[PDB]
Write a protein that binds this ligand. Structure first.
Ligand code: NA
Ligand code: NA
Lengths: 243, 243
């Protein structure tokens, strides 16, 4: 199973900061055929980001439209992503679910549009503080909402976002692992044992240079969707933890 | 004040098609100091489209929270950083498909004007609302949600979108003219006479080569936000109508 370290820059950065950050990223020697390394910048920063990054770094977009091409203002369709050579998209990130009101129905439709247009999909999900001893219940409902559409278990990457860890609570690798194995059990029951063992499951909580080793060494944790720490040059040490 | 023919490509285009399309656009010999022409590509096509278009063409993005943890969004700060001139706010598709309110429209313009972005702000009533004689009611509520934020009345552009004629019904140039005058009346009452004669009110309904002449020559119609007709080389004829 190939490891998958993803940087989600969210709504952050300038031309100068990307030039500085991508140059620091470039300096790390790693084998792209042994380790997947993906950076997700802002839509309007994509062209700039793709130019500055070396080809060992994969790239993608932080969202994709639930519709196709046509009269859908302010949206990026999966066709346009495929035409521009965009390899990855993120779908169902907690901030889109929370602020922009993306439902499990929208995540499914976004996944269908991505896979039909030969895009790889980083699919996010996870439970709140109040919900955590209902964790398995919630994650089962979220995974099953899209999981049957997965046509290739190398091109779809699951992300566990513990929303229970802007609350004050801190998640341990042990708590991550327990959920991770249950996510893989959900894939086993729905899509089969062979396909549950193919798929990458990322940890999309608070990841930094100190906790990534203890996390990535866990059995069912296959990489990260890293937020704030990926805006630092020290993001290379999080990539190093998966080498 | 100057005419203002804008191209809203919505969620359409490819690298090659835009390459062919922007070459037709550059082929038109016009005076940018006399007439503003703006192109609103998809966020990931912006860098591509800008570099293909000559300086006489202005450019913007179709949609605009500050910098932070807002996955899949483009803030006004980032838009400023990339020297993006215009943004579209409150287009009916965003109001419809993504539940954008009069509060979001107000907050986006406040953010846009704070970062020296120019804004093409859209509004309009449905068939149900026009049936109940609420055309001026609905426009007044939508306009008065944002019009007090307008500093320079060159740098904010109003777009009347007749949602009722987007349905089966077909808006005549005389019906569009009656509404455009009331919008200017609203602006004059709230902002002043000199401000109402500065501001542009664009017809954001169905515009093509068949009807552009009859709409453009109406007294209070100051240009267009053009949809599918702006995806063709014949868009130059729609620009010619405003010259
Ligand atoms: Na592992
Ligand atoms: Na006129």
């Amino acid at each position: 199973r190939k490891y998958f370290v993803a940087a989600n820059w969210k709504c952050n950065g300038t031309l100068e900061s990307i030039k500085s950050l991508t140059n620091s990223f470039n300096n790390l020697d790693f084998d792209p055929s042994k380790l997947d390394v993906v950076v997700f910048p802002v839509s309007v920063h994509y062209d700039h980001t793709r130019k500055l990054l070396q080809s060992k770094f994969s790239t993608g977009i932080e969202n994709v439209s639930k519709f196709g091409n046509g009269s859908y203002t302010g949206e990026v369709s999966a066709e346009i992503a495929k035409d521009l050579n965009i390899e990855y998209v993120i779908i169902g990130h907690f901030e889109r679910r929370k602020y922009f009101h993306e439902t499990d129905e929208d995540v499914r439709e976004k996944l269908q549009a991505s896979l039909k247009n030969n895009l790889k999909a980083v699919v996010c999900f996870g439970e709140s503080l109040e919900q955590r001893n209902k964790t398995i219940e919630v994650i089962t409902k979220q995974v099953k909402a899209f999981v049957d559409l997965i046509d290739n278990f190398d091109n779809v990457i699951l992300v566990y976002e513990p929303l229970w860890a802007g609350t004050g609570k801190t998640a341990t690798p042990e708590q991550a692992q327990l959920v991770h194995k249950e996510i893989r059990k959900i894939v086993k029951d729905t899509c089969g044992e062979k396909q549950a063992n193919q798929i990458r499951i990322l940890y999309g909580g608070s990841v930094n240079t100190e906790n990534c080793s203890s996390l990535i060494q866990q059995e069912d944790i296959d990489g990260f969707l890293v937020g704030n720490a990926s805006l630092k040059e020290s993001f290379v040490d999080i990539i190093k933890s998966a080498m």
